[model samples]
Target chain A: SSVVVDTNGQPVSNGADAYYLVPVSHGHAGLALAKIGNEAEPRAVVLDPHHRPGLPVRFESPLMINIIKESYFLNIKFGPSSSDSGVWDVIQQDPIGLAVKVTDTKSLLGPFKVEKEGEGYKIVYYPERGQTGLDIGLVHRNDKYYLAVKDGEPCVFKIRKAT
Target chain B: IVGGYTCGANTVPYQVSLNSGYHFCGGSLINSQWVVSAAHCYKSGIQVRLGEDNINVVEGNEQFISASKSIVHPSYNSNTLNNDIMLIKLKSAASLNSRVASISLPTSCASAGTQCLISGWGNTKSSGTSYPDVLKCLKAPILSDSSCKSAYPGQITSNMFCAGYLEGGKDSCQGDSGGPVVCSGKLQGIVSWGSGCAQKNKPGVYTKVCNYVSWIKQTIASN
Candidate 1:
């Protein structure tokens, strides 16, 4: 019976919107989703630029998760992109690493759902049309945590409306 | 009295006791003919008593006037208590005197930490049936928007503000609704609502008077 709420604790509307996907785990407090790696191959990474006092990654525009429409799926847009479709997709080759990709094709886009977790919410992705969905989690790779599908457990997040 | 002290006679000239046979709420005389109070205080057969100090005593300076019309804010929501403000047009104009006078509307919004005075003849205790015969006044400091939001999550609105001690022990209680909260010599707030009088971390919530000055003026002018 619980509805998705923004950082302000108000119910989130079913509209195209921008928000900060803050991790709910104590270990990741104050950290939010951002683009890692270079611009040509930007990947979703979590970092605490404000408290840590840096981000040469700083000059890099902070990434904001967007809801493209009424659906619960998430979209990641680095900047203006006419050719690139910002919808999220998962590579089938590695289900464990479950590397998520930002796809430009509409047919390859992944559909996601948000379910109430303990104190927050966990996002679940439907890789196939009418089958069991997999929860999205963090994958520790190259000294950084990349947003990926269920490696062991689902990652809880606080979807805060971007000011 | 709810962690407040009895005010000296004539100290709060603009303070008025609102009644429907007996003292029910408090108000501020905004002008000779219009009194400002809370929308929740609206009742039929309401009477306005200006220059009141002791409610039990026969004070000769008091001006007893019936309300000709009561105008609650158009957007007032009783459930949420938003826009909890109202203006009562007196049946007759009150004669200006030392003990019966009008208070000036706030020139600007009162900032957080501003020391303000809230006076009423409300219950001295939060849970008791006792009411003060003499007017009681409390020195409440305006809290920041963030602090108020933390106290009453998803309740605080732009039209409202919080004033009082966050630690508890001092506040305007029952029968104090619609009373004036004067800051810097101007009417800045009106007693609206709260969780409990003088409760820890629950400061007194009030209608931000400055936000309604234009509505007040326009309503009075048109009506």
Candidate 2:
């Protein structure tokens, strides 16, 4: 429930969007990539960018995996910019108004999960306990991370500090 | 530490300026051991982006400092608004600059009735957009925190600080977050939340830095 697409929606990563690196271990170590899925629908590709951009890849290590499983981002961006979901106005410029949602969701299994919802995809994060300052998200599109000021403006992700 | 060292001023200039020329406006040396900035300043992964305070931004008085760690304030609510203050611990305490020093926060900072100065890249006047390049500075009187509450009411809370003239116009707008809200020539507030940048009657809110002296100390302490 992190990203929300406009009625008509916006563009997808047409091989132009860059790879996204999410901080899986809440300790500030980001080791994952979210890209345009090879699926017919907007399926997400959670890859192990730490190695190679090849197939069958997963997240960072078990440590990162566990962290991502429980983290959340307070910001997100698009295309590769260092800013948080700063591409909203740019996204609004897109023909379709696909509003994307992003957040940090912790799972008992898939440790750190980055959510990107749009004309097709989306992401969310629910902390172990719903408290302030426990989550954050920064969505990226076309390979850039946008620095979002509003709730659903940027993207969503998680931050799981190692125990 | 190279002798020019001091307590509150230490800067880590980036080796290569990001895509923009903001190498100066975006970062600050809060203390010999800590750097203050917005959470967004610290990308997911970081390294020694030091040296080069020139146009090339890649070449300058050379130096390197490892990022011991970074902590973006927890309750940094961007939707309602920013508590968007963050601290970075450097592996080595940096040399200080008299011109560049850490701003102080007031512990008993009240709900309202305190005035201060605001400096940032926000628009000087009310407008749809902002100046795309260069940093802009402004004079913002501290809006009493409580008056700020009564000024905006609902969505106003204790974690936030306010500044600027509330009668409409002349306030911190966009690109103001993580910027300094100074008063009495000391850094006391950090531009955080607001209804609309420069909108009438709404002043920019900030994270009272002194209010979190303990937290700042906690983050900078051995960890």
Candidate 3:
């Protein structure tokens, strides 16, 4: 069977359910992600031309961050403006249990888009203000990753891939 | 590293000479002659802590007379992580109790969505503290092979088994590495890996106990 890659460029089975990279990210250049090349696979979203695996989010990226279950999400600290925006707000806090994303960007972040005004992909989401940690995305692509931060600075985070 | 830690699992943990750390990786009290656990548990000599409700506070003073006479398992692949299970033979039979209890082995374990229980002294959440001592138990449902495939898209190989909760928090951390995952009161999986303590989507992957019944039996019987 052929291998289908996810947003992070990890390979998937020939005919399998669409797996998203939980948590999200604003990817930076030269950050070789594990799921970058496996984009030929489709997320249960659609099939064929008008729909490509990785586009808006840029290179190898996925919707969910697949981590080893039952393991601990440790010593997480967020950064500022991994994107061009640079700020983590109070209103844009993160959801408690949603699988978030992470990316290597320049600014702390607001929206994760591609080369907006200064630098970085300007894709950002008004982070959920529930907890504290580095930046996390929600599979932002095609200008969908935007954050409506009412207050606070944009944040960044660190993560690890498990079993 | 762990200097001196013990839970209420095995009798040998009580002896001063058997000064090893008990990680609470579950072990199957398979009859009177042996105890089964993930082969990874056989790293050197681990101090077994059994027969206790609360592991951290309980400095169990019970020790069993056991010998590492043999370690058998043809499929134990350290490099690639293959056949990750093993059994230990005790010099004498342990008296049954709540903490030193016996768990049955499942006849089969290939189902995708099987719910199981895992107890260990691993870290609480990701990067949480390595438990000095504690046999905390967590229940995780078996993830479908396909769901596991998606959870680890490019990473899920055939040798790996998946389990866990997608939501972050409530998970088995590092110290719990070679533990047992109990399901339906039977042993099903061995703690292997998971992204975090309990992140959404990513379930914990275990060494599938079902795929290795014969190996388990043969190893325990021959050794």
Candidate 4:
């Protein structure tokens, strides 16, 4: 099975594997995806180093990421928490800010895909099949940078395996 | 005498009453020329009164200064009430004295269970238009992030924190928006909002001041 590769272009493993989605953009470098607060469904955001550090992202797809494929349905988990299920999903959309919430329902999970960008990859999602996908990028709202699918160039990241 | 008690004369020196014609919100004097408050408390013709204990009477120690600029966090969201912080630059620098002085910003974040003092001229009752004539102060302990999230569910954000009791009776109320929550003599939180003031299971939520220390410094430095 074809698999996703890290920054070193090495194949990523499946099952309980942890990785950090480090942003490749110069200004947003050193930041990674992290959950905010202790809500039942915490919102995802890209945290600055000076702020709280990011949680490791876990890929929960059964199939390894295929390079040739354009769309691959996958569920990404933010961190470990018994009180909340960290699976990412789009719960609501706003004209200015889109909200991406966490859910336990596998059926209500993301149909996200990772596409090869410049030197890394960009995570995108299909709100509906047979339609253009929206880029999962950071949107500044309420002083925190939330990860939302919005207009503009998609934020790229270098997937690095976490210990 | 619902929950909070009347403050001593000049005890809360950093406390400031924000007014247009009448007192609208409370604020903290962070520096000689700046007052920190909640962004949602924005109003035209904001006048800041320092060294004020009572609003109904004139005190000789009080210094009335007009706000030259009110800078709300660029990313402040009105709908979700996230980043509910605002800085007001005084038209003139305040005269520092025993009865009127600026409070220092927190060097670090206040931990859970840390007791803090919240002073304001807001409502005295949980639900009413009864505001205190003198400044009122309440001692509330900061709740853990887990407990705060449980209280507000999807509303709690990193920029905000909860403080007070789960059983109710102690909180910063309606007219208190932008008031100071001081911990260890440092400005730690700003009165933001909640489900209802002093309601059961609904603690007073505040803007986490430590998280905005950098932005505050940078904003002041550049301007």
**Chain A TM-score for each of the predictions:** 0.64, 0.21, 0.17, 0.73
Candidate 2 docks at the CAPRI level of incorrect
Q: Which stretches in model 2 have alpha-carbon errors above 4 Å? A: A1-163, B1-28, B38-42, B46-66, B74-83, B104-114, B122-125, B132-134
lDDT tens digits, residues A44-158, model 3? Answer: 1111123222222211111111111111121111221012121212222232122223333322112221111122112133232223333333333333333223123332222
After superposing candidate 1 on the true structure, give the runs of residues whose Cα lies further than 4 Å from its correct spot.
A1-163
Query: What local lDDT does model 1 show for residue B166?
Result: 83
Q: Which candidate leads the pack in lDDT? A: 4
Which predicted model would earn the best DockQ? Answer: 2
* Tens digits of lDDT, candidate 2, B93-165: 6553423334444555543444555554433434334233333446556666667777666656666667777
- Misplaced by over 4 Å in model 4 are A1-163
The lDDT, on a scale of 0 to 1, for candidate 4 is 0.73
DockQ for all candidate structures vs. native: 0.01, 0.04, 0.02, 0.01
> For residues B51-81, could you state the per-residue lDDT of candidate 1 as single tens digits?
8888998768888999999998999874456
State candidate 3's TM-score: 0.50
Docking class of 1: incorrect
Instruction: Arrange candidates, best DockQ first.
Output: 2, 3, 4, 1
Measured on C-alpha atoms, candidate 2 has an lDDT of 0.41
Residue pairs of candidate 4 with colliding backbone atoms: none
Worst 10 contiguous positions by lDDT, candidate 3 chain A: A61-70
Q: Total backbone clashes of model 4? A: 0
lDDT of 2 by residue, A1-163 (tens): 1221122232111111233333332223243333332424422322232423222112221110011111333223333222122222112212112323222332212212244433222333223223332112343445433222224543333322111
